[PDB]
Amino acid sequence: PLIVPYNLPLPGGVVPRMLITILGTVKPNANRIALDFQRGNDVAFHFNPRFNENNRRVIVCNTKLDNNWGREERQSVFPFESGKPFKIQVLVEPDHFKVAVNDAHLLQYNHRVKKLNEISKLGISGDIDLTSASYTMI
Ligand SMILES: O=c1oc2ccc(F)c(F)c2cc1CO[C@H]1[C@@H](O)[C@@H](CO)O[C@@H](S[C@@H]2O[C@H](CO)[C@H](O)[C@H](n3cc(-c4cc(F)c(F)c(F)c4)nn3)[C@H]2O)[C@@H]1O
Numbered sequence: 001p002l003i004v005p006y007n008l009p010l011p012g013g014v015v016p017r018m019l020i021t022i023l024g025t026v027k028p029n030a031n032r033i034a035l036d037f038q039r040g041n042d043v044a045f046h047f048n049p050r051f052n053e054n055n056r057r058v059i060v061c062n063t064k065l066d067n068n069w070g071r072e073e074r075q076s077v078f079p080f081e082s083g084k085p086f087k088i089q090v091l092v093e094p095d096h097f098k099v100a101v102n103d104a105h106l107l108q109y110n111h112r113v114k115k116l117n118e119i120s121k122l123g124i125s126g127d128i129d130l131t132s133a134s135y136t137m138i
Contacts (some may be wrong), residue, residue, distance in 0.1 A: 005125040008133045010037075013117035017138050020090040022124060023131040030082050030127035035090070037097075038121045041067065044113035045097050047090070049080050051127075063112040075107045085131075091138070092116065 014020075014037070022035065030051050037045040043064035050058050057078040063070045079101040080086055091098040096108045113119060124130060 002130040002132070004128060004130050005123060006130055006133060008122040008124065008135075010120050010122055010135070013039075013115070013119045014092045015116060015137075016092055016094045018092040018135055019138050020092070020122065020133075020135040022088040022090075022133045023085070024128040025085045025131065026080055026082050027127045027129065028083055030080075033080070033126035033128055034123070035088065036121075036123035036125070037090075037119050038123060039113050039115060039118045042113060044111070044119045045090075045109055047088075047099060047109075049078065049126075051080075051082065059107065061107065061109050065113075070112065073107075073109060077106060079104065079106060 026033070032051065033049045035045070035047040036043050046062045046064065048060040050060060059075040059078060061073045061075070087102055089100045091100070096110045098108045099106045122133065124133060
């Protein structure tokens with residue numbers, strides 16, 4: 001285990017074919033998880049599983065620019081479960097991030113922040129026991 005909140009540096013930002021893998025276990029009674037791919041203070045890609053938003057589960061994705069959240073993209077397919085180990089894989093592609101959880105495709109999120117080579121940190125927060133966070137080029 002690693003202790004959250006956790007910052008993974010992404011030196012020189014991200015690039016297509018970079019596969020970022022986050023392993024952990026959802027806590028009991030979890031309420032929220034967040035991945036924040038950041039360009040300085042801007043959040044190029046916020047990936048935010050919510051376990052209880054109006055008594056249902058949803059994945060909220062967004063971008064934050066100049067400290068203002070933009071338009072949300074929401075996905076009801078929700079592959080996480082309280083108490084269970086997960087693998088989130090974020091595959092950087094030329095026009096989008098592609099997210100697969102537990103080896104099943106979940107969603108794609110088109111790049112709003114264009115300067116991929118400046119998206120130099122991944123923040124990991126929320127109701128998890130973090131196991132590892134790493135990346136490789138496929
Ligand atoms: O209004 C509606 O009405 C409906 C009605 C019906 C329906 F079907 C709908 F879909 C809707 C949908 C809407 C839209 O909802 C909006 C709107 O209300 C808005 C007003 O300002 O506020 C946000 S909340 C805001 O969203 C951000 C992403 O956009 C971040 O996630 C923030 N955020 C989380 C974290 C964080 C920090 C941590 F440390 C963690 F560990 C962690 F996991 C997360 N930090 N920041 C979050 O605070 C709402 O989602």
